[PDB]
């Protein structure tokens, strides 16, 4: 009697009963377990950053130098500037410009002016300009002074024409005095590798080009290589997608 | 980048000849029907957050695997990166729609996204799926004859579909 | 991440110098206090389910309209997804207790929190109330200094949301 | 970069779970051994010039060819490179000893160092020998029990040694 | 402010040369679209009280809980400042209609929106649905080019809120 | 920048002597009671957004013209900047409280803030009243013995009050 009170008989043999049980019995808890299970391909928070070489560069803090800097803010600023601007190249104590540092310490020139002077120094020339073609010089200028790889061939054409017509000093001033440098860094911020994140207006290829230019936290833009500091992006810039074999 | 006019000009220049009557007529027709193109681009720009929201909802319902911990779009930052990528691709498709040529799309936007996503480890196939989801969610807004003069815009629907499909096929 | 150890190592590296006595003092303090923070982490991990469920219920109580049909909170999936989100937050609070710094919180939750909440119409006030309830209950669970460290991390997350 | 705590946290997040009880025990034990590790770091950092100079003396007495004209340490410039490379490696090994996790080495110190030394013509075998020599010279300073309370630290000696061998094998 | 001719002047002053043909004709198009712009601004202007009251009541209708006591919406002063807020949005939409550019909008409301909203816990949904009500009303008040152009600024502010 | 310890060190250096045992006693007393100072500054940091929102509500309740068109904080952007300013100065007051010295606040900004607000047209006495309101809102949380160990902290209240007072006066 009690069994029949339950309801009218349902025909036996439904193939959907296994799905009915899953849908019915605590769908919320099963849903939570489904949600919080691990994914098939395990990726940590910094998986992309470590598959790229530049994990540590992104994690690196931004450095700023305002007017009433006491001592070690200045000492750290100098090391950060010399490490980034000179492309992680070794700078011996003889080559270090003491007068520019004195001007910076007094505050006559901002950090941006000091960067400009370093770019016009003899170390910057002797390493990046005098030993490389103009393409490599433009790429190094972009990567160091602006923190990003070149976006297209128009940049190379414009900068090569500007150099040939107005000199190295004007070539460098076009970088530092540009609106882009003042937007991203401004006067008081040491430049950093900002191309690893998406930069407003960048090309699809800029990230890949900066990857080509980076070469690890250890690696540097010496010109002491057996190759002799040749350019890296000669064919990537003018023919972005395609590959050719002569 | 090029619009349609600049592309026709470049081809006429490579042939070293003036613009023919036929090409002038095609460009005049494009100009006369460019008003509907403006409306289509306005539809894309006014409803961008809605398109992204629909695409992301349907993608992560379709693929619980991404948002799921350990997956790609999990850590609550990579999710914002995903939404930003949807933003960028939709923006570039809108640019290519206004221009009339896919030059902005395949030049500024998607030359290296294949290898960028392979380097960052993201699954490009899910990105292409997301792009075509954006296509579907955008067509309903593009067709919407609400508050807009009724006409025929089959060519514009085809153009927008082709641009979204080009983006998906390139990134895939 | 951003622990005490990792922040020390990064700031020394940026200056290109070894670790002098100050950073070692900070590391010593961190190692001395690891015991209370790990105690708080184990207490939170023990009372995991209760905290999650109470937080969800508190959110519903302060946000009744969210339970109305045809709306964001209604639905078994959205209940489960609320539970999942609060579980994520509590997980990362325990992570920050263990790492003795707001490393995991900043890395996972806070980084990009604002625009993803905007792109999903998730009111931050829901999670603010959930974290307020978790703070209230961990006041009961934890006594002494584990209480202080926990409350620091919950309050940091609350500040990030608010 | 990752210490042991962040490493365990990353694994736990990958599993999508909290930290197991055994893992909490391990991390509490690690933080209990914190003061031993701090003295080891102090021994490395305080005696850094001594370790570097001793290792340099032994290295160049071993390989007299490096300092010959035409060798890869000949002028003062690349000898300063010698000393400064060794300084950086000791720096990062002390870092990894403090953090307990060898991640700082792999991320920063040894990131592109193979490619650097292979492009520069630097004999990587000599750099590996220099780092192993640095290991042997720094174990003396870690084992120095003067001015510290005595206590067994074989785990810390093994940790520093394996970090030095990691650096060597990643260079060699 | 950044209006069409203002964009022309600003972009040209960056380079040495004067205003060449393209920006002259852009200013042209702006001028011959000004007449619809100004008359649609007049149309949207003649209805301050009706539009603001209707949008206020629509917001209260879709979100009835704010009108309940203990919520930030409850209060005669709160309703009065709701009215002034919607009047502010309306006047700045009118400004943008006159200026043929979103200049006044981005100057007055968009600039520093989210920080203020989080400061006073105001919800962008309230204002976005009020703007949707204005969408509806302008659907009748305006015809053709006037209607489309005004709807552009209205839903641009809508996107800004969202 | 300076704190109480470095202030004492600098004055001793200026007089050129060794540190006096009396000044050593004051510094030891500061280090003993500095645990209370940590609770104070942690209260400030945790309650910061509530404190600044309280300050804004009280100001705009007592003052009206800053709301109306033509008022200094009228446009939505300008009052966003107003909130930013008040939270910034609260942060610097937290710095001063932690350090025990006012230098890091005064020498950093207060020399130029007065003239900046003068040129900008910002009513400075209103900013001082905002500082006072935010000071009382902070005092509400700083007298709060709840959820912490119980003790006497009137001297820390005096120091926080004098920091806020000095900031308000220097803005004026
Ligand atoms: C430049 C243009 C401008 C905008 C956009 C603006 C928005 C705005 N609304 C505010 C207050 C407010 N406004 C509201 C109204 C909200 N609650 C009601 O129910 C509605 C749903 C909703 C309005 C649509 C409320 C509740 C407050 C909180 C202040 C209080 O507690 O009394 C405030 C803080 C100070 C004040 O006005 O009293 C701003 C800045 N103010 C401006 O000067
Ligand atoms: C102008 C054209 C252009 C685009 C579009 C572009 C995309 C781009 N995506 C990136 C990362 C990313 N992109 C995504 C999104 C993908 N992964 C998920 O599976 C989603 C399904 C999918 C989105 C549809 C994610 C999750 C990351 C983070 C990868 C990581 O951190 O490991 C990055 C690295 C910078 C950053 O993380 O913010 C870029 C530059 N770059 C460009 O120059
Ligand atoms: C462009 C050419 C140039 C000049 C003219 C110059 C002078 C000069 N001396 C300075 C500091 C100084 N200069 C001196 C030297 C003076 N004080 C003592 O009485 C000495 C007897 C006397 C030496 C003639 C001292 C002691 C300081 C340190 C002041 C301080 O740190 O507060 C500073 C500020 C920080 C610095 O640059 O190191 C400048 C600019 N520096 C330059 O690069
Ligand atoms: C400082 C060392 C250095 C030099 C000199 C150099 C040459 C150089 N020639 C270029 C293009 C060019 N080069 C040439 C010249 C050739 N094509 C003609 O048929 C002639 C037969 C022939 C000249 C006798 C032309 C016509 C272009 C333009 C191609 C273009 O703009 O795409 C470019 C790239 C775009 C540009 O600069 O405008 C470079 C960089 N690169 C360097 O790093
Ligand atoms: C600044 C922003 C702006 C835009 C975008 C704009 C577009 C625009 N659309 C117009 C009418 C129109 N608009 C459309 C397009 C629509 N009809 C179809 O059914 C589709 C549903 C839809 C496009 C997908 C069509 C077909 C016309 C009539 C012209 C024709 O016969 O093709 C007109 C002529 C007069 C008018 O109605 O306003 C303009 C100027 N005007 C502007 O000031
Ligand atoms: C790494 C850490 C992490 C966090 C913090 C996180 C939060 C988070 N919750 C989400 C979904 C959601 N979250 C909520 C909010 C909850 N549901 C309601 O019951 C409550 C009122 C409320 C909490 C108190 C809702 C309703 C959704 C569904 C959104 C949708 O699909 O429309 C989403 C969108 C992804 C998806 O569609 O599944 C994120 C990113 N995700 C993460 O990976
Ligand atoms: C090509 C440029 C160049 C120079 C100039 C140069 C000098 C030089 N001499 C050195 C060693 C040395 N040089 C000396 C010479 C000093 N003690 C003597 O009694 C004199 C008082 C005095 C010489 C005037 C000594 C004793 C050492 C061994 C130091 C040691 O191993 O502890 C070293 C360290 C590495 C080595 O040679 O073992 C250098 C770099 N090396 C170079 O590659
Ligand atoms: C991640 C931290 C970091 C590391 C690890 C590092 C190693 C490093 N060593 C370098 C140069 C060098 N390093 C050495 C050192 C070796 N040669 C062997 O014979 C000796 C065993 C040993 C000498 C001490 C030498 C010889 C050079 C070549 C310098 C030159 O040729 O001008 C360079 C290239 C600098 C340049 O191009 O001027 C790097 C990047 N740099 C860094 O920023
Ligand atoms: C901020 C700078 C700083 C440091 C670095 C520091 C180290 C330090 N060493 C300690 C004891 C100790 N120190 C050591 C380490 C040494 N013992 C020898 O046997 C080993 C050769 C060597 C380690 C490789 C050991 C083993 C203990 C006792 C702990 C134990 O046995 O478990 C203690 C605990 C208090 C004590 O019992 O003396 C500290 C805090 N204190 C500081 O304020
Ligand atoms: C980090 C240290 C620092 C401080 C302290 C600082 C103060 C400061 N506040 C400013 C703007 C402002 N400041 C205020 C606030 C005042 N007006 C009223 O609302 C209130 C009575 C009162 C605040 C309680 C306002 C409304 C503006 C906007 C005026 C404008 O942008 O022209 C400006 C002009 C530049 C700008 O911020 O956009 C400065 C320099 N700047 C700094 O870099
Ligand atoms: C993780 C960061 C951190 C914090 C926050 C911290 C606070 C802290 N507060 C303490 C006690 C205390 N805390 C306070 C301060 C509070 N008492 C009330 O009366 C005042 C209203 C209020 C001041 C705002 C006082 C007065 C004591 C007692 C100190 C004594 O015995 O003299 C203690 C001593 C041990 C204990 O009580 O368990 C610590 C370590 N320590 C830390 O490492």
Cβ neighbours of residue C59 closer than 8 Å, sequence gap 6 or more: C66, C82, C126, C129, C130, C133
Q: Which residue of D has its CA nearest to A51?
A: D107
C149, with CB counted inside 10 A (0-12, 13-18, 19+), is: buried
What tokens were used for C48? 């995991």
Nearest CB to D1; choose among A45, A59, A218: A59
- To test the contact with chain C by mutation, choose from A28, A58, A79 the residue with the greatest count of C C-beta atoms within 10 A, namely A28
Q: Which residue of A has its CA nearest to C2?
A: A59
E119 contact F CB<8A = yes
What tokens were used for C154? 């919950």
Helices (H), ranges, chain A: 2-6, 17-24, 27-36, 47-51, 55-59, 72-85, 98-106, 111-119, 122-124, 134-141, 153-166, 168-176, 179-184, 206-214, 234-238
Nearest residue to B130 (alpha-carbon basis) of B53, B77, B17 = B53
| Subunit contact B46:E162, Cβ cutoff 8 A | no
Residues of chain E contacting B5 with CB distance shorter than 8 Å? none
Q: By three-state DSSP, how is residue D154 classified?
A: helix
- To test the contact with chain C by mutation, choose from E63, E64, E65 the residue with the greatest count of C C-beta atoms within 10 A, namely E65
DSSP states of E36-53 as a string? HHHHHHHHHHTTHHHHHH
Residues with CB under 6 A from ligand 1: E 59, 66, 72-73, 77-78, 81-82, 85-86, 88, 108-109, 116, 120, 122, 126-127, 130; F 60, 67, 74-76, 79
Residues of chain F contacting A68 with CB distance shorter than 8 Å? 1, 107-108
DSSP states of D91-146 as a string? HHHHHHHHHS-THHIIIIITSSHHHHHHHTT--HHHHHHHHHHHHHHHHHHHT--T
Beta bridge partners of A189: A64
Pocket lining: D80 vs ligand 8, CB cutoff 6 Å: no
Helices (H), ranges, A37-167: 47-51, 55-59, 72-85, 98-106, 111-119, 122-124, 134-141, 153-166
What tokens were used for B45? 């720009």
Chain Cα centroid distance, residue E60: 20
Dist. CA B149–CA E102, nearest whole Å: 24
- b/e burial code for range B11-36 (CB count within 10 A of at least 16 → b): eeeeeeeeeeeeeeeebeeeeeeeeb
- Do B162 and B131 meet the contact criterion of CB atoms below 8 Å apart? no
D24 contact C CB<8A = yes
- Taking the CA atoms of residue A151, residue A153, residue A159 and residue A162 in that order, the dihedral angle to the nearest 10 degrees is -140
Nearest residue to A139 (alpha-carbon basis) of A151, A131, A127, A121 = A151
Choose which residue among D113, D116, D168 to substitute to test ligand 8 binding: the one with the highest number of ligand atoms within 8 A of its C-beta: D116
Dist. CA A195–CA A192, nearest whole Å: 9
Pocket lining: A214 vs ligand 2, CB cutoff 6 Å: no
Q: Please tell me what resolution, in angstroms, this structure has.
A: 3.1
- Do A27 and C76 meet the contact criterion of CB atoms below 8 Å apart? yes
DSSP states of F74-129 as a string? -SHHHHHHHHHHHHHHHHHHHHHHHHT-SHHHIIIIIHHHHHHHHHHT--HHHHHH
Q: Whose CA is nearest to atom 39 of ligand 7?
A: D76
Dist. CA B119–CA B112, nearest whole Å: 10
Instruction: Please report how the helices E113-120 and F76-99 are oriented relative to each other, as an axis angle in degrees rounded to 10.
Output: 70
Identify the residue whose tokens are 């009963």.
A17
- Taking the CA atoms of residue E47, residue E51, residue E54 and residue E58 in that order, the dihedral angle to the nearest 10 degrees is 170
Residues of chain A contacting D13 with CB distance shorter than 8 Å? 44-45
Pocket lining: A140 vs ligand 4, CB cutoff 6 Å: no
Nearest residue to F164 (alpha-carbon basis) of F111, F91, F99, F114 = F91
User: To the nearest whole angstrom, how far is the Cα of C25 from the nearest Cα of chain F?
Assistant: 15
| Subunit contact C120:B53, Cβ cutoff 8 A | yes
Residue C24 alpha carbon, nearest atom of ligand 9: 1
| Subunit contact E119:F53, Cβ cutoff 8 A | yes
Pocket lining: A189 vs ligand 4, CB cutoff 6 Å: no
Task: Name the structure determination technique.
Answer: cryo-EM
Which stretches does DSSP call E strand in chain B? none
Angle F43-F47-F50 (CA atoms, 0-180°, nearest 5)?
A: 155
Chains with 3 or more CB pairs under 8 A to chain A: B, C, D, F
Identify the residue whose tokens are 């009557």.
B21
Q: Which residue of F has its CA nearest to E116?
A: F80
- Do D103 and C13 meet the contact criterion of CB atoms below 8 Å apart? no
Identify the residue whose tokens are 């203002």.
E6
Dist. CA F75–CA E109, nearest whole Å: 7
Pocket lining: A107 vs ligand 3, CB cutoff 6 Å: no
Residues of chain D contacting A222 with CB distance shorter than 8 Å? 119-120
Q: What is the 3-state secondary structure (H, E, C) of B36-59?
A: HHHHHHHHHHHCHHHHHHHHHHHH
Touching status, chains F and C (3+ beta-carbon pairs under 8 Å): yes
Pocket lining: F7 vs ligand 10, CB cutoff 6 Å: no
Nearest residue to A129 (alpha-carbon basis) of A231, A233, A24, A2 = A231
B69 contact D CB<8A = yes
Residue A174, CA distances (Å) to A139, A166, A169, F43 in order:
14, 11, 9, 49
Q: By three-state DSSP, how is residue A64 classified?
A: strand
What tokens were used for F39? 């609770």
| Subunit contact C24:D12, Cβ cutoff 8 A | no
What tokens were used for E131? 């703007």
- Do E56 and E86 meet the contact criterion of CB atoms below 8 Å apart? yes
| Subunit contact E108:F83, Cβ cutoff 8 A | no
Cα F77 to ligand 1 centroid, rounded to whole Å: 14
Dist. CA D35–CA C24, nearest whole Å: 10
Touching status, chains D and E (3+ beta-carbon pairs under 8 Å): no
User: To the nearest whole angstrom, how far is the Cα of D95 from the nearest Cα of chain C?
Assistant: 7
- Do E105 and E92 meet the contact criterion of CB atoms below 8 Å apart? yes
Cα F81 to ligand 10 centroid, rounded to whole Å: 6
Dist. CA F142–CA F137, nearest whole Å: 9
E122 contact F CB<8A = no
Dist. CA E48–CA E93, nearest whole Å: 12
What tokens were used for C111? 């980084």
Dist. CA A238–CA D142, nearest whole Å: 56
User: To the nearest whole angstrom, how far is the Cα of C136 from the nearest Cα of chain F?
Assistant: 10
Cβ neighbours of residue A92 closer than 8 Å, sequence gap 6 or more: D77, D80
C21 contact A CB<8A = no
Residue C126 alpha carbon, nearest atom of ligand 6: 24
Dist. CA E61–CA B29, nearest whole Å: 49
F32 contact E CB<8A = no
| Subunit contact C108:B75, Cβ cutoff 8 A | yes
| Subunit contact E112:F53, Cβ cutoff 8 A | no
Chain Cα centroid distance, residue B30: 19
- Do F99 and F135 meet the contact criterion of CB atoms below 8 Å apart? no
Residues of chain D contacting C29 with CB distance shorter than 8 Å? none
- Do A36 and B67 meet the contact criterion of CB atoms below 8 Å apart? no
Cα A104 to ligand 3 centroid, rounded to whole Å: 12
Pocket lining: E145 vs ligand 5, CB cutoff 6 Å: yes
Q: Whose CA is nearest to atom 20 of ligand 8?
A: D82
- Taking the CA atoms of residue C97, residue C103, residue C107 and residue C110 in that order, the dihedral angle to the nearest 10 degrees is 70
Dist. CA F148–CA F145, nearest whole Å: 6
- Do C37 and C103 meet the contact criterion of CB atoms below 8 Å apart? no
Cβ neighbours of residue F46 closer than 8 Å, sequence gap 6 or more: C152, C155, C156, C159
- b/e burial code for range F61-92 (CB count within 10 A of at least 16 → b): eebeebeeeeebbbbbbbbbbbbebbbebbeb
Nearest CB to B147; choose among E139, E156, E159: E139
Instruction: Please report how the helices F111-120 and F154-171 are oriented relative to each other, as an axis angle in degrees rounded to 10.
Output: 50
Q: Does residue A36 come out as left (phi exceeding 0), alpha (psi in the -120 to 50 range) or beta?
A: alpha
| Subunit contact B79:C116, Cβ cutoff 8 A | yes
C12 contact A CB<8A = no
Nearest CB to C34; choose among D8, D12, D28: D28
CA-based R_g, chain E, Å: 18
What tokens were used for E34? 């000004």
Dist. CA A72–CA A76, nearest whole Å: 6
- Taking the CA atoms of residue A5, residue A9, residue A12 and residue A17 in that order, the dihedral angle to the nearest 10 degrees is -60
Q: How many CB pairs under 8 A join B and C?
A: 31
Pocket lining: D12 vs ligand 9, CB cutoff 6 Å: no
């Amino acid at each position: 009697m009690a069994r029949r009170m339950a309801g009218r008989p349902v025909p036996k043999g439904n193939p959907f009963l296994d799905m009915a049980r899953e849908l019915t019995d605590n769908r919320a808890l099963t849903l939570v377990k489904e949600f919080t299970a691990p994914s098939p391909y395990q990726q940590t928070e910094t998986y992309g950053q470590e598959r790229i070489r530049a994990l540590g560069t992104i994690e690196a803090p931004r450095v700023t130098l305002r007017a009433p800097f006491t001592d070690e803010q200045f000492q750290g600023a100098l090391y950060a500037i010399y490490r980034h601007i000179f492309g992680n190249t070794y700078v011996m104590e003889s080559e270090r410009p003491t007068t520019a540092e004195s001007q910076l310490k007094d505050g006559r020139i901002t950090v941006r002016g000091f960067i400009k002077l370093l770019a016009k120094s003899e170390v910057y020339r002797s390493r990046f300009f005098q030993k490389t073609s103009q393409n490599r010089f433009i790429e190094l200028n972009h990567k160091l002074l602006l923190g990003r790889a070149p976006y297209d061939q128009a940049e190379i054409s414009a900068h090569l024409d500007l150099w040939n017509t107005q000199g190295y000093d004007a070539e460098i001033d076009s970088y530092v005095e540009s609106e882009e440098y003042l937007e991203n860094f401004g006067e008081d911020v040491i430049p950093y590798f900002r191309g690893f994140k998406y930069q407003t207006g960048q090309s699809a290829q800029g990230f890949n080009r900066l990857l080509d230019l980076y070469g690890g936290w250890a690696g540097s833009d010496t010109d002491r290589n057996q190759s002799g500091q040749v350019a890296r992006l000669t064919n990537s810039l003018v023919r972005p997608g395609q590959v050719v074999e002569p | 980048m090029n619009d349609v006019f600049t592309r026709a000009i470049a081809q006429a220049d490579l042939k070293g000849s003036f613009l023919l009557e036929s090409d002038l007529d095609k460009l005049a027709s494009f100009a006369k029907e460019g008003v509907k193109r403006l409306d289509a681009v306005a539809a894309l720009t006014n409803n961008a957050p809605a398109i992204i929201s629909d695409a992301a909802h349907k993608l992560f319902a379709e693929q619980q695997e991404l948002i799921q911990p350990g997956g790609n779009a999990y850590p609550h930052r990579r999710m914002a990166a995903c939404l930003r990528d949807m933003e960028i691709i939709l923006r570039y498709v809108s640019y290519a729609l206004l221009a009339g040529d896919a030059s902005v799309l395949d030049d500024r936007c998607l030359n290296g996204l294949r290898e960028t996503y392979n380097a960052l480890g993201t699954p490009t196939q899910s990105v292409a799926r997301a792009v075509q989801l954006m296509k579907d969610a955008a067509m309903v807004h593009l067709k919407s004859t609400a508050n807009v003069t009724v006409g025929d815009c089959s060519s514009l629907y085809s153009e927008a579909a082709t641009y979204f499909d080009k983006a998906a096929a390139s990134i895939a | 991440s951003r622990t005490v150890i990792t922040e020390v190592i990064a700031t020394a590296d940026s200056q290109g110098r070894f670790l002098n006595s100050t950073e070692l003092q900070a590391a010593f303090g961190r190692f001395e206090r690891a015991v209370p923070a790990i105690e708080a982490a184990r207490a939170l991990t023990k009372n995991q389910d209760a905290l999650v469920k109470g937080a969800v219920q508190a959110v519903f109580k302060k946000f009744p309209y969210v339970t109305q049909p045809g709306e964001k909170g209604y639905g078994d999936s959205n209940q489960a997804k609320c539970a999942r989100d609060i579980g994520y937050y509590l997980r990362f609070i325990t992570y920050s207790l263990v790492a003795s710094g707001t490393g995991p919180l900043d890395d996972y939750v806070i980084a990009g929190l604002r625009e993803v909440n905007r792109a999903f119409n998730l009111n931050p006030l829901w999670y603010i109330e959930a974290l307020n309830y978790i703070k209230g209950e961990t006041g009961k669970l934890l006594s002494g200094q584990s209480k202080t460290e926990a409350l620091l991390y919950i309050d940091h997350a609350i500040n990030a949301l608010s």
